[PDB]
Amino acid sequence: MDVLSKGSLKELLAHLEKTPLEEAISYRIGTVPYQNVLISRNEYYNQLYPDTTSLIDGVSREGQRNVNGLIMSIISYVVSGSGHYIPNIGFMLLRRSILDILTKHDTGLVTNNLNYGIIARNLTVSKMNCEQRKRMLICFKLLAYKDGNQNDYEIYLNQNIPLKQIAPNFIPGDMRTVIHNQDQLAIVGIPLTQSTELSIRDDNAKSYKLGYVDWYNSNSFLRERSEFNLIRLKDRDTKYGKLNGW
Amino acid sequence: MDVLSKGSLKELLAHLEKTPLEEAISYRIGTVPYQNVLISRNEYYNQLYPDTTSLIDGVSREGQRNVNGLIMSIISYVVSGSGHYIPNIGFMLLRRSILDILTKHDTGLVTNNLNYGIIARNLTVSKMNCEQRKRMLICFKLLAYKDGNQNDYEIYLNQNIPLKQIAPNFIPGDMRTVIHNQDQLAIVGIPAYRLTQSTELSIRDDNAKSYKLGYVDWYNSNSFLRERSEFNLIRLKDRDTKYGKLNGW
Amino acid sequence: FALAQINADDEFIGAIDKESAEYLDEYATLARDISNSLTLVKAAFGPLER
Amino acid sequence: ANRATSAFLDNPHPVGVNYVDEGSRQFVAVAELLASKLIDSSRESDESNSDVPFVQAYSKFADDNPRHLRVKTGGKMANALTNVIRSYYSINAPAIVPQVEIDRLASKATVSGDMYNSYAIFNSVPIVEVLSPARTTVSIVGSDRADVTMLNTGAGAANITFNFGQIAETVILKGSVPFQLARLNQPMPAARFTYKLRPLDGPFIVVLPVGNPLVISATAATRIQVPLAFNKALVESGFQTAMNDGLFDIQNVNYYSSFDEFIISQYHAQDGINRVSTCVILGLALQAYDQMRRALPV
Amino acid sequence: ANRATSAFLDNPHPVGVNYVDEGSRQFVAVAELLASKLIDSSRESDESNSDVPFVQAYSKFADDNPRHLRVKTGGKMANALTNVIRSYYSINAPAIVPQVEIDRLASKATVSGDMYNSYAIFNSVPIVEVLSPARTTVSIVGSDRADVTMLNTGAGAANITFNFGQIAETVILKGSVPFQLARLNQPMPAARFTYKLRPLDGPFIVVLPVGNPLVISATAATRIQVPLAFNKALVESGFQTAMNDGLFDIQNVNYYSSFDEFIISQYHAQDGINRVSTCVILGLALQAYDQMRRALPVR
Amino acid sequence: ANRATSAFLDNPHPVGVNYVDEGSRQFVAVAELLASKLIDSSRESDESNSDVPFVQAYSKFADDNPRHLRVKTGGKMANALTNVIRSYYSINAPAIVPQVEIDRLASKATVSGDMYNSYAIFNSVPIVEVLSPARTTVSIVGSDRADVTMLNTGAGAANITFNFGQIAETVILKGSVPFQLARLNQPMPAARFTYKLRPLDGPFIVVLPVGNPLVISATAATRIQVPLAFNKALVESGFQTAMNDGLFDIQNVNYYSSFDEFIISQYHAQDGINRVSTCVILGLALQAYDQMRRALPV
């Protein structure tokens, strides 16, 4: 809910630096990602409404234990607000922040073999709005410059002309580009009636939209009560035990 | 609507004396009775609601051109508010009052051969209510005393016990009996319950409800006579007097 | 024959009649009072006999 | 070829046409509401250590105060409710209660006689026909759970046709042993224990192998629109009470084990929609009757 | 000789003879006016985000105030209109609407019940009969535009006669190839592509030379007196809604693809003048039915 | 056996999945309302010999005053409406209108954005498949009125099966000569000129005698939920303009001669309910596009 309200590249990057990977992942099994299902939308139809599940719905789904699974969960969190279920990630990765997973080499994750075309297909980029595509391209560009695969990012953009039109105009190394960026990446925001939408993505997105006004006021006190005497998880000092399976 | 509002034997008989026979008959062709039909009742169902047309509905229906049909139309008007389509009766008969047709030999109509069994069967009596049955028994009693068939009327009542229980008690030639009678014969009136503007499934119930809501509109309109406010404005002939009695009674 | 002209321009603020609006709102307070009073009497005084 | 049918679905008798209008519907709603207060007045009397709550409840229901030398009967409303129930069951029953009495009793409490603001589930399984070929015995037993016993004494497998009507919403079939069932002009699937089917789909063919008998249990669910005050448990008890008291004792009518069978049998008549509305109003009247007579036995 | 005819002109079923007096036509006129205001109020409510304009219009139409948990169906006026529409369509349909109800609803507004203020143009092409010799094949397809396919198999040229009735005012014939058409006992002009014919002239003879088939496209226009509030677009939509809603399912009746075919078929029958008057009233009622149903919908 | 299918029902392309939320629906309804005011203002300006009514309307629509030297295009609202039309048609359209632009444009006028408060009738006739035996020729022509031409060349009469889908409400069949049609496993009636059918009833068999060809003309009506501002006359005209203006020139898409064929074809695809809602929004957008471009040609 907080990641969706960020409307600037500066605010989105600042949030990712503060947020650990734990809130990008989820601990709920969910269902299989791609599946033709019939859902009940009684506000419109007596019959069951056909739809296809995906990873863009704000609902947890099963993900494999690999770098592709971790990347998909991070992007889904940015573009949808809810991550995926990757089993037993490990303490060392969960304590790192999202941006360091995307842009730093000390995390212990190899991302040199990522295929951008396959990730977009798996994330169903076709059923994404303008804001979501921009956020996905920000994550792609950060990974591309981290591993030196800047050429592959350009090849992917050239193959997808519509994405090339709305691509972000920032260079990950430079800071002048981030300061002067003028993109609008906000998905949720204060304005809508308490009604139901037909699609799973549209219904879940509207649920975040209607709950943002209430979340703006109620989160302050309830949060502060939780970590009144709690040590911050992000970059927590430890004995640096091990990283298993990566 | 006016006939269905009468609540006593005095008012009902007084109204029949004033009104002519042309009110009992209708000049609209209508449809035929005893026909299974599918009607549209959309407030309740999407499909078509089955029902059966009868002579007791408030809609005009084609009737037979005989004395049997004429009597059925008169009783239908009394118990339902509308009559049947029997044209070319003749202006001599149409000018006379409904009461005169029922209980006077001077009109010229011959009703001795009429049988109360088929008339009650045709004017479906298993579908009537208590008030409708009482009015029909009044018409039968008036006819029976016209042709001197009092014994036949009694035997018919003794055959059908429920009709005997609700049969009005009055002698057609005596006015004291009409005054003493305290039966309630009103089919429409101001309702103590909550009357809404909603449809009913049956043809009989829907038409009856239309008359009921129509009477409320007429009761509150300018055509109604409020006795407590304008009793001095009515003429002396039509003013309520205890000495008043039906002609020939 | 001697009809009097009636003007209510000063009573209306735009298209809103303040006095009529406040007067009608007082029936809501009376409605709450009626319900509260009836319930209290029924609780304090149960079934009544004479 | 023989055909078999459910016993309770045979020859539904016509229902009454009186006491269906708005005023009469509100009389039944008032009678149900006031009879309910009668039962609850007993618990109030226990808590209050006095009979005053019961006296108030009976005075409103009967217009007369209770007496110690008289057996409490309910007065005019009890008499009106009893006679009105009789008229509903058969068209041969007299309509004795006057309209004026109905309107006066309907003004006692504020209600709306809307009988189409809710629904109920009725579990009587309708088997209109079961067509079997020669050398095959079919027996239908039961009304709430219908058990069909099938025996094939012939040389080869037989095809038996089921017809569940066009009214029931769902029917679930559970067999003693796995069997094959399919719609007309459809291929048969692998043998399964349970089938869920919509009667509107069409007649169903079940393959009967030669050997031990095959028994199929049928359970059906039907939705009928009823008033919000409807309670199936009270209606069912009222049906048995009225039958014992002889309110249904009239010539040329049929007798049913439960109100579930009565309403479904009437719904499957030639024009069953006409009789469903009257049957539901009879249900509310029976629910009022059960409460009234249990509080005031006679 | 072989004979062919239009499919939609075959056996026009009789129409109703009820609710055709001054009061009933006034009631149908009032229903159309109040239905139109119901549609407009629903639009005004939507652009204004207030239910007040719709509630007031529904209160006039249904004589009752809308309440939640109760479905808005139009009340007694909708019930009377639906059953009256059935009665107009067929003589087998029952008459179950009392006269006191018609009079009450007619008084709700002050409009004239006259149904002959204006006219309308109807596009159905009536082909009563097409007679051809033994060695020829004729097929007639269509109602808004009739395609007559003629094939000559014999050696000699054939003469085919066309009858267009006496009701249509003009008929325009266009051929795939130029052809010859002339009235009875008249010389045949040079082959042309189009002809403009008045059906009252008489049967028309068309020469069919041996060879490739000749196809004639027929377009007709006829004028029928209708009330000034008559809108053809609304009537056609109401005709389809009534057919889909199932209120034209009466015994021994014919079914048509449009109100255009229905009114023309009744016109081309015995006592066709009297049938057209009843059908015009049914058309205005269908206009009221369409507007009322769109304002208050069901799923 | 041969199969005959209507041309317009073959391979419907996927529709766009963007700009179908409540905010985007409100923007389309706002655009229609302001486009209608733009047309009326032009008529008022011509009648009143003044430019004041048109300047006010154009300023509200385009957020800029009209200028004599500059061209009148409609401003950003025209560009947004043009782009969403492309996005509605195909899933491969760029969909490059920001959310912030849509919200600011939906706040100009107050509309509910509800696309389910009314209905409209669409006249395209769906003929999914016509199954014919050997030595028979079947041809289907037309989409608003379908003519099925059938020729029999075999020894005896042939049975030809018609499948009208499961979505259309009613189908009316009128033949050139009287013919016989009946449902599956039903006796055939006498020859008749006309037939009224429900597509849900099932496949229909037509007996084709040996001899002259038989032509059956089909007409169907289907009900689809649309907004109260929906106008079929304006939608169809706007559909032609968008095709002429190249808004539908996308790769791997189908083309239709009318909006009626487009919506019915998408209805009959696999899970067609998913696409009807988006197609109705496109229709309302095409209504606004028609009125705007006619007032401000480009």
Residue by residue, DSSP assigns D189-247 as: ---EEEEEE-GGG--EEEEE-SSS-EEEEEEEEEEEEE-TT--HHHHHHHHHHHHHHTT
What residues contact residue F83 under an 8 Å CB cut-off, 6+ apart? F94, F95, F96, F97
SS3 of residue D119 by DSSP? strand
Measured in angstroms, the CA of D31 and the nearest CA of chain B are apart by 14
- Using DSSP bridges, classify how beta strands F129-132 and F146-152 pair: parallel, antiparallel or unpaired: unpaired
CB of E108 less than 8 A from some CB of B: no
Dihedrals phi, psi of F151, to nearest 5 degrees: -125, 130
CB of F250 less than 8 A from some CB of A: no
F contacts of E141 (beta carbons < 8 Å)? 147, 176, 215, 217
Measured in angstroms, the CA of B19 and the nearest CA of chain E are apart by 18
Q: Which residues pair with E175 in a beta bridge?
A: E216
Helices (H) and strands (E) in chain E, counts: 7, 10
Round to whole Å and give the CA distance between F51 and F41. 9
Using left for φ > 0, alpha for ψ between -120 and 50, and beta otherwise, residue F23 falls in: alpha
Asked if A195's CB is within 8 angstroms of F99's CB, the reply is: no
Round to whole Å and give the CA distance between B77 and B56. 9
Round to whole Å and give the CA distance between E118 and D9. 59
Using left for φ > 0, alpha for ψ between -120 and 50, and beta otherwise, residue D19 falls in: left
SS3 of residue D10 by DSSP? coil
Asked if E82's CB is within 8 angstroms of B40's CB, the reply is: yes
D contacts of C46 (beta carbons < 8 Å)? 48, 52
Measured in angstroms, the CA of D196 and the nearest CA of chain F are apart by 21
What residues contact residue F251 under an 8 Å CB cut-off, 6+ apart? F92
Name all contacts of E61-67 with Cβ < 8 Å and 24+ positions apart: E61/E34, E61/E35, E61/E37, E61/E292, E62/B197, E63/B197, E64/B196, E64/B197, E64/B198
Measured in angstroms, the CA of B235 and the nearest CA of chain D are apart by 32
Neighbours of D44 (CB within 10 A): 18
CB of D157 less than 8 A from some CB of F: no
| Chain D residue at shortest CA distance from F201 | D201
Chains that touch E (3 or more CB pairs under 8 A): B, F
User: Two tokens at D111?
Assistant: 């209600």
User: Two tokens at A154?
Assistant: 């350009």
Q: Where are the alpha helices (DSSP H) in chain B?
A: 9-18, 67-80, 91-95, 98-103, 116-122, 130-146, 150-159, 161-165, 175-180, 203-219, 227-230
Residue by residue, DSSP assigns F91-144 as: TTS-----HHHHHHHHTSS-----S-SEEEEE------EEEE-TTEEEEEE-SS
Measured in angstroms, the CA of C49 and the nearest CA of chain D are apart by 8
B contacts of E274 (beta carbons < 8 Å)? none
Single-letter code of the amino acid located at B104: K
What torsion do the CA atoms of D109, D110, D116, D120 make, to the nearest 10 degrees?
A: -50
Using left for φ > 0, alpha for ψ between -120 and 50, and beta otherwise, residue E202 falls in: left
Round to whole Å and give the CA distance between A60 and D11. 58
Q: Assess contact for F43 and A218: CB atoms under 8 A.
A: no
Question: Which C residues in the span 3-32 are in contact with D, Cβ-Cβ below 8 Å?
Answer: none
Asked if C46's CB is within 8 angstroms of D48's CB, the reply is: yes
In which element (H, E) is residue E37 found? helix E22-48
Single-letter code of the amino acid located at E113: G
Round to whole Å and give the CA distance between A134 and A184. 9
| Burial grade of B13 (CB within 10 A; 0-12, 13-18, 19 or more) | buried
Identity of the residue in E64, E78, E95 whose CB atom sits nearest the CB atom of B59: E95
A contacts of F273 (beta carbons < 8 Å)? 45, 47, 49-50
Measured in angstroms, the CA of D264 and the nearest CA of chain B are apart by 17
Neighbours of B148 (CB within 10 A): 9
CB of F200 less than 8 A from some CB of D: no
- Using DSSP bridges, classify how beta strands B61-62 and B84-85 pair: parallel, antiparallel or unpaired: parallel
In which element (H, E) is residue D176 found? strand D170-183
- DSSP code of residue D166: S
In which element (H, E) is residue F235 found? helix F232-244
Round to whole Å and give the CA distance between D99 and D80. 11
**Exposure letters F242-262 (e unless 16+ CB within 10 A, then b):** beeeebbeeeebbebebbbbb
Round to whole Å and give the CA distance between F205 and F216. 13
Asked if A50's CB is within 8 angstroms of F273's CB, the reply is: yes
Specify the residue for token string 């031990």. Answer: D212
Using left for φ > 0, alpha for ψ between -120 and 50, and beta otherwise, residue B148 falls in: left
Round to whole Å and give the CA distance between A131 and B103. 92
| Chain D residue at shortest CA distance from F202 | D201
Q: How was this structure obtained?
A: cryo-EM
D contacts of C47 (beta carbons < 8 Å)? 48, 52-53, 55-56
| Chain D residue at shortest CA distance from B163 | D94
| Chain F residue at shortest CA distance from D201 | F201
Question: Which F residues in the span 173-192 are in contact with E, Cβ-Cβ below 8 Å?
Answer: 174-177
What sign has the CA pseudo-torsion F120, F121, F124, F126?
Answer: positive
Round to whole Å and give the CA distance between D74 and E50. 51
For chains F and A, having 3+ Cβ pairs within 8 Å is answered yes
In which element (H, E) is residue E280 found? helix E272-295
Cα distances (Å, whole numbers) of residue B71 to B26, B77, B87, B121, B141: 14, 10, 14, 13, 13
User: Among candidates F229, F264, F291, F239, which has minimal Cα distance to F88?
Assistant: F239
Q: Which residues pair with E136 in a beta bridge?
A: E152
CB of E97 less than 8 A from some CB of B: yes
| Burial grade of E220 (CB within 10 A; 0-12, 13-18, 19 or more) | buried
What residues contact residue B139 under an 8 Å CB cut-off, 6+ apart? B71, B74, B75, B78, B102
| Burial grade of E165 (CB within 10 A; 0-12, 13-18, 19 or more) | buried
Chains that touch D (3 or more CB pairs under 8 A): B, C, F
Cα end-to-end distance, chain C, whole Å: 60
What residues contact residue F54 under an 8 Å CB cut-off, 6+ apart? F41, F42, F44, F45, F66
What residues contact residue B60 under an 8 Å CB cut-off, 6+ apart? B26, B28, B29, B30, B82, B83, B84, B85, E95, E99
CB of E177 less than 8 A from some CB of B: no
User: Among candidates E113, E115, E75, E82, which has minimal Cα distance to E96?
Assistant: E82
- The residue ranges of DSSP E strands in chain E, in sequence order, are 2-4, 118-122, 129-132, 136-141, 146-152, 158-163, 170-183, 192-197, 204-208, 214-226
A contacts of F22 (beta carbons < 8 Å)? 192-193, 195, 197, 206
Compute the half-sphere exposure of residue D5: CA atoms within 13 Å on the CB side of its CA.
10
Compute the half-sphere exposure of residue E184: CA atoms within 13 Å on the CB side of its CA.
8
Q: Which of the residues B135, B193, B196, B205 would you substitute to probe the D interface, choosing the one with the greatest number of D C-beta atoms within 10 Å?
A: B193
CB of F223 less than 8 A from some CB of A: no
